[PDB]
Amino acid sequence: FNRGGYNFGKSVRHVVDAIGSVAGIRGILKSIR
Known part of the structure; x- marks a missing residue:
């Protein structure tokens, strides 16, 4: 890693x-369902 996550x-x-x-x-999510 680098940033560590924290x-x-x-x-x-x-x-x-x-x-x-x-x-x-989220908008395209309506296309994924």
């Missing part, structure tokens, strides 16, 4: 995009 900044950057990735995951 981070609280980098991962936030990834999750941050997740907040918007929902439209490209």
Whole structure:
């Protein structure tokens, strides 16, 4: 590993995009069921 997982900044950057990735995951999820 690198960050370890106990981070609280980098991962936030990834999750941050997740907040918007929902439209490209949750929205498309309706196509996955």
